Amino acid sequence: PHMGAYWMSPTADDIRAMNRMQRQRVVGFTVGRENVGSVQFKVPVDLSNINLDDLFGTIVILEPRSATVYPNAAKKPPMGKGLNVPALISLEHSWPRGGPTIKGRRLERHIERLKSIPDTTFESYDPETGVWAFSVEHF
């Protein structure tokens, strides 16, 4: 696999510089990984109890075509708490089998399948870049 660095927005520096009130309600918090995709939380999140330097690969795991938040059910907070909130997920490399030149009906059936994935709400598929974007309500 060919993956680059994890990142977050606002940055860990920005969040470390917030006061307690601000860090309890971080808007548009996004965790991504170069050449994989990103997870953007759709409601404000409380990061006061999250270690920003033990987040990538521990709480949020981004692998090719796969995003995971809280892989260990025993340590997963209740729905609506921590990062267990609705999120917009964008995944690169989501092409039809055959790759970027597959168009027409074969591409349409691929989009149909992505629109139907259980527990997701389809947002978009970009046929030129291979990005599938969709929302989930909990992890």
> Looking at residue 18, which CATH number applies to its domain?
3.30.1610.10
Contacts 24+ apart (CB under 8 A), 124-132: 125/94, 127/100, 127/103, 128/100, 129/92, 130/92, 130/93, 130/94, 130/95, 130/100, 131/37, 131/90, 131/91, 131/92, 131/94, 132/90, 132/91, 132/94
Query: With contact defined as beta carbons under 8 Å apart, do 54 and 111 qualify?
Result: no
- Domain count along the chain: 1
Residue holding tokens 């994935």? 117
**The dihedral formed by the CA atoms of 48, 49, 50 and 54, expressed in degrees to the nearest 10:** 130
DSSP-derived pairing of the beta strands 87-91 and 60-63: unpaired
Strands (E), 35-110: 37-41, 60-63, 66-69, 87-91
User: Which approach determined this entry?
Assistant: X-ray
For residue 113, give the H/E element and its range. helix 104-115
Exposure class string for 66-98: b at 16+ Cβ within 10 A, else e: ebebbeeeeebeeeeebbbbbbbbbbbebbbee
Q: Which amino acid belongs to residue 64?
A: P
Cis-peptide into 10, omega within 30 deg: yes
What secondary structure letter does DSSP report for 38? E
* Contact residues for 31 (Cβ-Cβ < 8 A; gap 6+): 6, 7, 8, 38, 39, 55, 56, 60, 62
The resolution of the experimental structure, rounded to one decimal in Å, is 1.5
Domain that holds residue 71: 1-139
Q: Is 125 left (phi over 0), alpha (psi -120 to 50) or beta?
A: beta
First and final C-alpha spacing in the chain: 25
Q: How far apart are CA 40 and CA 134, in angstroms?
A: 10
